[PDB]
Every structure is written in C-alpha cells, then in structure tokens.
Design a protein around this ligand. Structure first.
Ligand SMILES: *[C@@H]1O[C@H](CO)[C@@H](O[C@@H]2O[C@H](CO)[C@@H](O)[C@H](O)[C@H]2NC(C)=O)[C@H](O)[C@H]1NC(C)=O
Ligand SMILES: *[C@@H]1O[C@H](CO)[C@@H](O[C@@H]2O[C@H](CO)[C@@H](O)[C@H](O)[C@H]2NC(C)=O)[C@H](O)[C@H]1NC(C)=O
Ligand SMILES: *[C@@H]1O[C@H](CO)[C@@H](O[C@@H]2O[C@H](CO)[C@@H](O)[C@H](O)[C@H]2NC(C)=O)[C@H](O)[C@H]1NC(C)=O
Ligand SMILES: *[C@@H]1O[C@H](CO)[C@@H](O[C@@H]2O[C@H](CO)[C@@H](O)[C@H](O)[C@H]2NC(C)=O)[C@H](O)[C@H]1NC(C)=O
Ligand SMILES: *[C@@H]1O[C@H](CO)[C@@H](O[C@@H]2O[C@H](CO)[C@@H](O)[C@H](O)[C@H]2NC(C)=O)[C@H](O)[C@H]1NC(C)=O
Ligand SMILES: *[C@@H]1O[C@H](CO)[C@@H](O[C@@H]2O[C@H](CO)[C@@H](O)[C@H](O)[C@H]2NC(C)=O)[C@H](O)[C@H]1NC(C)=O
Ligand SMILES: *[C@@H]1O[C@H](CO)[C@@H](O)[C@H](O)[C@H]1NC(C)=O
Ligand SMILES: *[C@@H]1O[C@H](CO)[C@@H](O)[C@H](O)[C@H]1NC(C)=O
Ligand SMILES: *[C@@H]1O[C@H](CO)[C@@H](O)[C@H](O)[C@H]1NC(C)=O
Ligand SMILES: *[C@@H]1O[C@H](CO)[C@@H](O)[C@H](O)[C@H]1NC(C)=O
Ligand SMILES: *[C@@H]1O[C@H](CO)[C@@H](O)[C@H](O)[C@H]1NC(C)=O
Lengths: 68, 404, 184
C-alpha cells in the first residue's frame, strides 16, 4: 500500500504494485476488491478492471414507446 | 394563475478518506524494545486494526450502494434534442479528458509515519460514468428503468406523466412547452451562476474535509507530548536514565499515546456513524426522488417536486432538484357544492369557483375554468343538508343532441 | 484474552503479585493492573455503545419498513423491493428479521408509435389516464403499465383547447358511442 517495489507478475496500480497476479485487459465481475478501480479474482489469480455492468444504449426517439 | 420552475441544491456527504494506521509505528516506530514491551498489552493493536478495516469496508460498501443503484450503463443519444429543453450543463462534455460535465468540473475545482490514506475503490471516472448512466436512464426512460427493463419514452410524455402524478393536467404542458423549456433553461443558468459565485454552497464537504484534516493533524501533534516524561523522544530517555525508571517512563508515554489513539479511533467511529447516516439519507433520496416521482412534501426539495439530477462530487453527492412552484394567485369565491333541481352536485376533482357573476370548475393547482356538467360532477343527495350551498344551473352535454 | 495481559507487570495473576511482591509497590502494581483493565473495559463499553447505536438505527429502519410496506401499500420506488412493490411477508429470524418481498416486474416490451394528443374536428383530445399508441395503421389508448389497446372514446378522453397550439399532433377520428345510439 503506497510502497513502490522497484527498490525492494508485476502490475503497478495507484495503490501499489501487485505481485503474483497477472493483469488481464478483459474485464469481468469483481470478487475481491482492492482499490483504485482495479480488483483481483480467482478463476490461477488474475487482476482486471472492475466492470460496471452490461452496456445498454436505449434507442430514444421523439415518437416511440416500449409499452410492456 | 401562473407557475415557475425553480432549481435547488442539496448536498449530502457519503464517505470520507480512508485511513490506515499502524500502532507500533505511530507509538514508537523502529524500537525493538518498544515492540517487545507492546506485546504484553494484549490485542489492542489487532482490535484497532480490525475496527479500522471494518469502517473502511463499510465506507466502501455505502459508497458503492449510494451510486451503483442500477446494473445497466446507459448512454445518451447523439442527437441532443428533447423538445426544446437544454441539458448541456448536466451531460458530460466529450471534450473533457475525464469525461466530466462542466458542473462536475466546477465542483471539483471548488473543493480543495504509520498513518496513511488508502485510495478509494470507487474513484472519479466510474462514479462520473454511473452518474451519466443514471442521467441517461432518467432522461430516456423516466421511472421505468429503475423498476425493470428500460423503456424508451419522449421527454414531453415523461413531463406529462410527472405532471399527472403531481396533480396537474396535461393541457397546460403543450400550450406552454416553449415557455416551460425557457424557464427551465433560465433557472439552470441562474443556479449555475449562483453556484459559481457563492463559495459557501459546498460548505458541508468542506467542513467534513477540514474536520478530517484537523483530526489527522491532532493525532500527529499528540506524538510531541511529554505525558509526564522529560522529553517527547524515547531514545534520550532510554540512553540517559537508568532502566528501572526508564521502563516506567516509556510505559507512561506509550499508554498516553495509546489513550490518544483510542480517543482518535472513537472520534473516527462516531464520524463514520454520522457519515453512514448521511449516506443512508442520500440513498433514500436516490431511491425516492431520482429514479421515480416522490409524493412526499418537502422531503428532497421545497414545493411540488418533479425530478432531481444527481451530480458527482468529491466525497459526496449533490442533487439538482427541480420543483413546481405556483405563482400569481387571484381572489375567487368558492362554494361547497351546487344545488340544481333540488339535487346537490359535487366536483369529482375540481373546485367550484366564481369571478363575481359566473361559476366555473378549476383545478387545485392551476386556473382553468370549465362549464359545470354531468361528466365532472356526481350527485349524492339533496341540497339542504349541506350549509353554504348556492344556486347555479348545470348544463347537460347530451341535451342538444336530442333537442333537435 | 485481555485477562492474560500483564500491562508491564511480572505476572497476569493478582494473587501471585500479592504473595510475591512487597505491599508498598504491590499496591502500585495492582493499581496499574486495575486502571489498565478499566481502560480495556471502557474501550469495550464504547464499542458496545457504537454497535448498539448502529443496530438501533437498523431496527428503526426495519420498523419503518414494517409500518410502511407490510401493514399497507407504499408508493416509494425501490424502498423495500426492486420495482413496483406489492406486499411483503415478515418472517422470524435469530436476532433479526427477514422480509419476503413481492414485486411487480414488467417484461416483453414492444415498439409502438405515440402522439401527444389527437386533433379531431379542430379540437385537441387528451387521454385522461391512458396514452395514445399506434401499431402502424390505427391509434389506441392503453394504460402505462400494460398493453391493453382500446378504441378512442370520449369517455376516457377530455377535450381542452384546439390542436393549433400543440406540437407533433396527428390526425385521427374519435369514436362517439352516442352517435350510433341516436342513429337508430
Ligand atoms: C407567467 O409568467 C411568465 C414569466 O414568469 C410570463 O412569461 C413572460 O411573458 C412576457 C409577455 O407575455 C414576456 O415579455 C416575458 O419575457 C416572459 N418571461 C419569460 C421568463 O418567458 C407569462 O406571460 C406569465 N403568464 C401569465 C398568464 O401571466
Ligand atoms: C444550451 O446551453 C448551452 C450553454 O449552457 C448553449 O451553448 C452556448 O451557445 C452559444 C451560441 O451557440 C455560445 O455563444 C455559447 O458560448 C455556448 N455556451 C457554452 C458554455 O459553450 C447552447 O447553445 C444551448 N442550446 C443547445 C441546444 O445546446
Ligand atoms: C367571469 O368569467 C366569465 C367567463 O369568461 C365572463 O363571461 C364572459 O364575459 C365576456 C365579457 O366580459 C363576454 O364577452 C362573454 O360572452 C361571457 N361569457 C359567457 C358564457 O357569458 C364574465 O364576464 C366574468 N365576470 C367578471 C365579473 O369578470
Ligand atoms: C336557491 O333555491 C331554493 C329553491 O328555489 C331557495 O329555497 C327557497 O327559498 C325561499 C326564500 O329564499 C323560501 O321561501 C322557500 O321555502 C325555499 N324553498 C326550499 C325548497 O328550500 C333558496 O333560497 C335559493 N338560494 C338562494 C341563495 O337564493
Ligand atoms: C393494427 O391493429 C388493428 C386493429 O387491431 C389491425 O386491424 C385489423 O387487422 C386484422 C388483421 O388483418 C383484420 O382482420 C381486421 O379486420 C382489422 N381491423 C380493422 C378495424 O381494420 C391492423 O391490421 C394492425 N396493423 C398492424 C400493422 O399490425
Ligand atoms: C390535419 O387536418 C387539418 C385539416 O383537416 C390540416 O390543416 C390543414 O393543413 C393544410 C396544410 O398544412 C392547410 O393548407 C389548411 O389550411 C389546413 N386547414 C385547417 C382547417 O387548418 C392539418 O394540416 C392536418 N395535419 C396533419 C398532420 O395531417
Ligand atoms: C515506481 O518507480 C518506477 C521507477 O523508479 C516508476 O516508473 C513507477 O511509476 C513507480 N511506481 C509508481 C506506482 O509510481
Ligand atoms: C422529432 O420531432 C420533432 C418535431 O415533432 C423534431 O423537432 C425533432 O427534430 C425530431 N427528432 C428526430 C431525432 O427526428
Ligand atoms: C384577496 O382579498 C384580501 C382581502 O379582501 C386581500 O387581503 C388579498 O390581498 C387579496 N388577494 C389578492 C391576490 O389580491
Ligand atoms: C362565514 O362566517 C360568517 C361569520 O362567522 C357568517 O356570517 C357567514 O354566513 C359564513 N358563510 C358561510 C358560507 O358559511
Ligand atoms: C425498437 O426499435 C429500436 C430501433 O428501431 C430497436 O433498437 C429496439 O430493439 C426495438 N425494440 C423492440 C422491443 O423490438
């Protein structure tokens, strides 16, 4: 936490560098929170950006409705 | 006879900066004998660490709960047309590298040895994304996205729905849609100017940050206390006095430091409880009058509430409540009922009013005269039991159809 | 485990201190143990009061939910259940309460075309409680929570003003049930 490991699987974050977990570009559901928007999970252990949710862009129109 | 659109700001803190402290580092630091002597006191350090981790994860939990009220990230349509309404101030600016609206930029600019500050799990960028998604959901779906799947709806249709929910007919909307949009834009500009001109508008988060900084400064400065010893430093006492009294002096110093740390922990605990209560209030406001229409009076806005736009704030949340305020009242003569042909007529939803010589039915929030007929009134008994009735004829809508 | 601490003394048992140390300094050692355990008890009491305040707030919220959406109907959105709340069933729990919420969730949306009003005979017709929808050829009125198309009728619509001031209106006729009644 707040300690750089360059003067002591390395991924440097805002909180600090993570040792033992590899960074993955793909984002999934968070299981173990860490901080600074990056959290790790077990699938081996990997680190990835937190996923807010599925993207859904509703088609807004001036004269359209979706009645249930 | 008239109405105005007013916007108000309500600020509620949701979280503070997370703090992590090490007991053995804060009390003495790099002394091996102090570390050995601290092990016989029990599990005070473990209890303090557990309490700090618990309040930190509670802060993270309520910060996630107050913002991530939906699991779908909505995006604004590329066409920024909503029937003449303007929302450029609340919608994020694509030109900004942080994808933040100029309002959020103004709020961000207006806010300025063992202990350390842990960065929050929910930082600025996805909080801004969550606020943008909530704005898109409340501008394209109304309350339908907060109660299930998102349903597309025109903005004037949502305005008519909210007006009917608050008790206003849809006649006055389309007749003055341009006037309503102009009033809303003028109110938005005026409240933006007031927010930019008044430095005390965001005072709640300012005093929260000031209190946290003052508590940290007091905790730091309490280390320079003699606490009955010759000096606040421990190596001089260790290397100067004999160990039989040096042990007692170090014991007194470390127990004073432990008492100060316990006082700071208790203050942090009660401040976290207050912040949790404020975050619960903010979450109730979020659930009530953001993703839907709230029938409560003066709960999250003065006057007849219509909607609110949540805005991202540093260590807090700021709501832009838009309310309905009547204006330009006029004097009229009212009657409890109307006696016609020996029968009492009562309005279904209006009120019998008179301008001096003619009687009309009007809404309880706006003035709209109409002829008293059988569709908007019901008959229940005769017209002598009630006190204060007047005499007025009732026109039959269906009579001229068969009169010819 | 706090009873096993020594607080800078030589033993964790007061009997050993009394039977092994001279009383002029044994009194001071016993006083130090007493004040250390008093500080520990004060910390425990403060933690208990903080936890009791938090649990009291939680129980006040639970009693508010009990009063609001168990004994009656609450119009609050997502207060005690996601979506349109209907009712909830309280169940006993050890040192707690469990709510069995029942909610109304719409599904299976369908695309349709709407108009703000209907201009008939130079007058604007507005729905009293429904909303005008179109499937492509004809216009129908239905509630905002379900798809129940119906013929446009003056019973469920009110006329107020003309259609020359509204924006985006369409042209359609309005069925009057009195006309076939007087036709025969
Ligand atoms: C209700 O109030 C609004 C303003 O609060 C009035 O709108 C003004 O109308 C005059 C002339 O009609 C214009 O010169 C002003 O520029 C308008 N102001 C705004 C802010 O648009 C409106 O006329 C009032 N209506 C009634 C019936 O009194
Ligand atoms: C909505 O409001 C924004 C500003 O609040 C308007 O943007 C202004 O447009 C004028 C003329 O195009 C410029 O002179 C100003 O500099 C703009 N303001 C800013 C802050 O850039 C905008 O025109 C309004 N209308 C719409 C449809 O967006
Ligand atoms: C009260 O309101 C009624 C309704 O507008 C007024 O009746 C109209 O008055 C105007 C002139 O003032 C006439 O041209 C209309 O023919 C009247 N309508 C009907 C149906 O008769 C009435 O004058 C108002 N009274 C006062 C004292 O202001
Ligand atoms: C409204 O009309 C009723 C019925 O025409 C009036 O009641 C009569 O009032 C007169 C004197 O005002 C009495 O002599 C009758 O006996 C009353 N008849 C009944 C059936 O009560 C009533 O006075 C009228 N109200 C006003 C304000 O003029
Ligand atoms: C829109 O709905 C109307 C009414 O439900 C449909 O009109 C009917 O369509 C069926 C199917 O062929 C015919 O058998 C009926 O005779 C029609 N009724 C009338 C009064 O015309 C219409 O077809 C629907 N349009 C679409 C595109 O689905
Ligand atoms: C609905 O019908 C009315 C008349 O039945 C249309 O109004 C006419 O519009 C044309 C061209 O816009 C004008 O030349 C006429 O003078 C208008 N007549 C009247 C009496 O206003 C109206 O345009 C129609 N609307 C739609 C959307 O079709
Ligand atoms: C650690 O130091 C290296 C170089 O000394 C630097 O590139 C890196 O950004 C530092 N880590 C952090 C988190 O700043
Ligand atoms: C929707 O219709 C209105 C007028 O009815 C028009 O001003 C607006 O540009 C239209 N929007 C789109 C996206 O076509
Ligand atoms: C209505 O009349 C009362 C007294 O007759 C007066 O005090 C009041 O100001 C009037 N209301 C308006 C809007 O003028
Ligand atoms: C209103 O009160 C006054 C005095 O109390 C009384 O003379 C008058 O008749 C009352 N009017 C009505 C409509 O009750
Ligand atoms: C309605 O149409 C839009 C685009 O025309 C589409 O994205 C959407 O999926 C449609 N909704 C349904 C329920 O088919």
């Amino acid at each position: 936490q707040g300690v750089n490991c360059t003067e002591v699987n390395v991924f440097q974050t805002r909180a600090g560098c993570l040792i033992g977990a590899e960074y993955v570009n793909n984002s999934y559901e968070c299981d173990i929170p860490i901080g600074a928007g990056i959290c790790a999970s077990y699938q081996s252990i990997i680190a990835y950006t937190m996923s807010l949710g599925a993207e859904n862009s509703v088609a807004y129109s001036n004269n359209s409705i979706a009645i249930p | 006879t008239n109405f105005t659109i007013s916007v108000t700001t309500e600020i509620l803190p949701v979280s503070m900066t997370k703090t992590s402290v090490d007991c053995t580092m804060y009390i003495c630091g790099d002394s091996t004998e102090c570390s050995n002597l601290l092990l016989q006191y029990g599990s005070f350090c473990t209890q303090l660490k557990r309490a700090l981790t618990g309040i930190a994860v509670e802060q993270d939990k309520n910060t996630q709960e107050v913002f991530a009220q939906v699991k779908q990230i909505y995006k604004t349509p590329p066409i920024k047309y909503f029937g003449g309404f303007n929302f450029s101030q609340i919608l994020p600016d694509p030109s900004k590298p942080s994808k933040r609206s100029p309002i959020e930029d103004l709020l961000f600019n207006k806010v300025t040895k063992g202990l350390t500050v842990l960065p929050p799990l929910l930082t600025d960028e996805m909080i801004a994304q969550y606020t943008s998604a909530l704005l898109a959901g409340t501008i394209t779906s109304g309350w339908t996205f907060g109660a299930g799947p998102a349903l597309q709806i025109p903005f004037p249709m949502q305005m008519a729905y909210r007006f009917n929910g608050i008790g206003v007919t849809q006649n006055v909307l389309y007749e003055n849609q341009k006037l309503i949009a102009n009033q809303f834009n003028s109110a938005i500009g005026k409240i933006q100017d007031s927010l930019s001109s008044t430095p005390s508008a965001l005072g709640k988060l300012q005093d929260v940050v000031n209190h946290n900084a003052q508590a940290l400064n007091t905790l730091v400065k309490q280390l320079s206390s003699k606490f009955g010893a010759i000096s606040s430093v421990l190596n001089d006492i260790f290397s100067r006095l004999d160990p039989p009294e040096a042990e007692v002096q170090i014991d007194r110093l470390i127990t004073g430091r432990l008492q100060s740390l316990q006082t700071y922990v208790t203050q942090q605990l009660i401040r976290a409880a207050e912040i949790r209560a404020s975050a619960n209030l903010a979450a109730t406001k979020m659930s009530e009058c953001v993703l839907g229409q709230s029938k409560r009076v003066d709960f999250c806005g003065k006057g007849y509430h219509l909607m609110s736009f949540p805005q991202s704030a540093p260590h807090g949340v700021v709501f832009l409540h838009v309310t309905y305020v009547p204006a330009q009242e006029k004097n009229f003569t009212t009657a409890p009922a109307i006696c016609h042909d020996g029968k009492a007529h009562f309005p279904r939803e209006g009120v019998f009013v008179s301008n001096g010589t003619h009687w009309f039915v009007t809404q309880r929030n706006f003035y709209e005269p109409q002829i008293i007929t059988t569709d908007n009134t019901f008959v229940s008994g005769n017209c002598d039991v009630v006190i204060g009735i007047v005499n007025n004829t009732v026109y039959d809508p269906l009579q001229p159809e068969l009169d010819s």
